[PDB]
């Protein structure tokens, strides 16, 4: 059938989620095939000269190449219906922030000029955020009305665009933001290292950031609920101050084990939070009520709180042990009204597992995912057990092995990988 390039943009809400939901909606049609997804691109909002500053929020843009038996006017109707389902107000103030925009950028060499639909899109050749993903998908494409134009040169003329390292792949990377004393680096008149560390995660491609205040050191000083909350709160305030300018606004996960902390942080910051990553699922019943109320994603971790190393898990019954435990916590979440698609599992390599047990469980991650019918979060970064490394390996060695395992997990389409370095 006929090939089309669909342009997709967003500048409000959970931006990568918005794009993905538009693409899933297309892919769910039996009369559409997705041929290829482009890279993600970041640009400043193109606005009228007198627009309120509140509308000046960075866009996330891409495009998809599809084949379909739908004719152009039928495709347009579908796109409008997808916009509605995602939550767009089709009659909102032009130029104002929007959860999604879908445009038919091109249809092979078709030239269609009607009041309701022009193809190629009239502004294709004036918008770097539409031309760049289009040319990535169709390298030799010429605009059928302007065949002489070298569109690669035109794109350079337009400029004003960043090709991100965030992607539309099945595996998304969760970059670690540790606010404990392990990362303390305040100077006389600055506390900005975590600011450079946030930028490094964003630039390097992290789609999600996981913010936690607990140290990972054995025998670290424990922290009050107030101190944990305050550290998260501060960071979140900072993030909110910068949202509109970031080249890419990451999904935000909060890494805490304490119900109190989850309550107070959600009450204050729910609209910027995508997920709660729970380090120890004690009091899952009341945590489930809070996750239901705020419609967030939640991670069940296999952390049974084992302090006696002799009691660590052996490989031979490890699959059953992890499944039984996660299954029971899943069923509690489901009985509290949480949608199963909002629940992820994490084997928890550093919690109560022998090294061979950790390796064996990672080797069987896909079977575990199928058995539990839950998406997987893998936290392998700097963990010598799953990396197959000596426990005193240096950081360069830990990070190298981490990156190599990351590539392998991405090829296996693991849902989320939690890492220190992308
Ligand atoms: C604010 C602005 C400029 N700032 C940005 N800044 C950055 N950095 N990045 C951005 O992405 C960005 N976006 C921006 C932006 O406004 N976006 C809206 C893009 N789209 C959305 C779909 C249609 S909505 C109106 C009708 O157009 C008619 N129509 C005719 N031809 C077509 C066609 N080929 N495809 C679909 N609809 C078509 C239908 O009948 C529809 O009812 C057209 C509209 C546009 O282009 O004006
Ligand atoms: Cl060209
Ligand atoms: Cl991509
Ligand atoms: Cl991709």
TrEMBL record:
It comes from the Bacteria. Keywords: ATP-binding, Folate biosynthesis, Kinase, Magnesium, Metal-binding, Multifunctional enzyme, Nucleotide-binding, Transferase. Residues 171-422 form the Pterin-binding domain. It holds the Pfam family Pterin_bind. It catalyses: (7,8-dihydropterin-6-yl)methyl diphosphate + 4-aminobenzoate = 7,8-dihydropteroate + diphosphate. It is an enzyme of class 2 (transferase). This is 2-amino-4-hydroxy-6-hydroxymethyldihydropteridine pyrophosphokinase/dihydropteroate synthase. The gene is folK.
């Amino acid at each position: 059938g006929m090939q089309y390039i669909i342009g997709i943009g967003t500048n409000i809400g959970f931006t990568i989620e918005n794009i993905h939901l538009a693409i899933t909606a297309l892919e769910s049609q039996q009369n559409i095939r997705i041929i290829r997804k482009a890279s993600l691109y970041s640009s400043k909002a193109v606005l009228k000269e007198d627009a309120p500053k509140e509308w000046d929020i960075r866009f996330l843009n891409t495009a998809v190449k599809i084949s379909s038996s739908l004719k152009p006017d039928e495709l347009l109707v579908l796109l409008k219906d997808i916009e509605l389902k995602i939550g767009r107000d089709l009659n909102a103030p032009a130029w104002s922030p929007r959860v999604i925009d879908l445009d038919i950028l091109a249809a092979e060499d078709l030239i269609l000029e009607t009041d309701k639909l022009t193809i190629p899109h009239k502004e294709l050749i004036n918008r770097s955020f539409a031309l760049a993903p289009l040319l990535e998908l169709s390298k030799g494409w010429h605009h059928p009305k302007y065949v002489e134009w070298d569109l690669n040169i035109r794109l350079k003329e337009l400029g004003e665009i960043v090709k991100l390292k965030q992607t539309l792949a099945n595996t998304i990377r969760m970059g670690i933001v540790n606010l404990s004393n392990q990362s303390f680096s305040d100077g006389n008149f600055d506390d900005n290292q975590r600011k450079l560390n946030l930028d490094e995660l964003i630039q390097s491609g992290a789609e999600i950031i996981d913010i936690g205040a607990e140290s990972t050191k054995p025998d670290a000083k424990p922290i009050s609920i107030e101190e944990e909350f305050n550290k998260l709160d501060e960071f979140l305030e900072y993030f909110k101050s910068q949202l509109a300018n970031l080249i890419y606004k990451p999904l935000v996960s909060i890494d805490t084990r304490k119900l109190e902390v989850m309550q107070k942080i959600l009450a204050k910051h729910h609209d910027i939070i995508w997920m709660i990553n729970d380090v120890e699922c004690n009091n899952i019943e009341q945590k489930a009520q809070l996750i239901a109320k705020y419609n967030k994603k939640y991670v069940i971790i296999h952390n049974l709180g084992i302090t006696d190393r002799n009691q660590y898990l052996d490989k031979e019954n490890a699959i059953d042990n992890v499944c039984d435990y996660i299954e029971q916590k899943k069923q509690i979440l489901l009985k509290h009204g949480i949608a199963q698609q909002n629940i992820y599992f994490d084997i928890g390599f550093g919690f109560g597992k022998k090294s061979d047990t950790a390796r064996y469980l990672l080797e069987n991650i896909i079977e575990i995912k199928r058995r539990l019918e839950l998406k997987a979060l893998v936290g392998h970064s700097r963990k010598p057990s799953v990396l197959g490394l000596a426990k005193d390996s240096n950081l360069a060695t830990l990070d190298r092995a981490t990156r190599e395992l990351s590539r392998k997990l991405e090829k296996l389409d693991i849902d989320i990988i939690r890492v220190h370095k992308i």
